[PDB]
Structures are given as structure tokens and as C-alpha cells.
Structure 1
Amino acid sequence: MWFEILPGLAIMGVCLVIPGVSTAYIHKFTNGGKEKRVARVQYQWYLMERDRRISGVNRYYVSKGLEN
């Protein structure tokens, strides 16, 4: 019947959901728990560079709070 279309469509769906989930998780993991910052504009790039220079480890995601 029509139920036999669903198998290949299931393989489809898994292979099409894998990309987004994978990229999101990789971004979080490689940017330390926060989704990748976006530099649409030179101001945001400047802020990210300031964060990198302030981290002391040369990584923009490492954050410093009032304790600093």
C-alpha cells in the first residue's frame, strides 16, 4: 500500500535532520556552551576582538565577569 513509501522517507527525514542538529551541537561545543557569535557588522567584530584580548587565553568565548 502507501505505507511502503514511508521507509525511504524515514531515511530521508533522518538524513535531513542530522545537518542542523549536528551543526548546532558542534557550534556549542567548539564555542564553549554558547552558540557562535555573529559579526554582521564591524562593531560586533570589534566587541568579539575585545573579548578575545580580555580573555587571556585568546578565545573570545571565554568570558570574564565582575570578578575581574
Structure 2
Amino acid sequence: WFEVLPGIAVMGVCLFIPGMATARIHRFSNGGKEKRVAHYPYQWYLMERDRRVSGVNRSYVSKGLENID
């Protein structure tokens, strides 16, 4: 009832890695924000619009109200 807990504690950590890894790639590749999901073709139209007007070539930088004054 004792020695079986180290056997668990190597397997149990081994699924804490891929959940923490992928959650800190999308949040890290796009600068501290979640990743935009797009299930419907209308939802793609906002991102592909936003890429044309955000700053350079990205759907993950903002423009803001202060941009157009």
C-alpha cells in the first residue's frame, strides 16, 4: 500500500507533461493569449481580415480604439 505509490507517481507525471506543454505553446507562440479557433467559415473571415490590417502579418496583435483616434 506504500511501494505502489512511486509506481503511480512516474506514470501520473507522464501525462502532466503534454497538457502543460501544448497549453504553453499556443499561449507562448501568440504572445500571452489563447489561440483563435475557427469552426465556421464566417469565423475565418474575421482573422483573414484582421491579418490584413493588424500591424504586419499576424492575427494575434491588436489595433485598439486609439489607432484610428
Compute the TM-score of the two structures, normalised by the length of structure 2. 0.88
Deviation at 1:32, TM superposition (A): 1.3
The equivalent of 2:20 in structure 1 is 21
- CA distance in 2 between partners of 1:52 and 1:45 (Å): 11
Spell out, residue by residue over 1:25-58, the C-alpha distance to the aligned partner (whole angstroms, 9 max, x if none): 1110001111111011111111111111111311
- 2:38 is the alignment partner of 1:42: no
- CA distance in 1 between partners of 2:15 and 2:63 (Å): 38
Compute the TM-score of the two structures, normalised by the length of structure 1. 0.90
- CA distance in 1 between partners of 2:20 and 2:6 (Å): 21
> Runs (4+) of structure 1 moved beyond 3 Å?
none
Q: Give the SS at the match of 1:67.
A: helix
Contact 2:55 2:63 in 1 (8 A): no
- Paired AA for residue 10 in structure 1: A
- 2:40 is the alignment partner of 1:55: no
Q: Which runs of 5+ in 2 are unaligned?
A: none
How many pairs are equivalent? 67
Deviation at 1:9, TM superposition (A): 0.8
- Paired AA for residue 8 in structure 1: G
Q: Which runs of 5+ in 1 are unaligned?
A: none
Contact 2:26 2:35 in 1 (8 A): yes
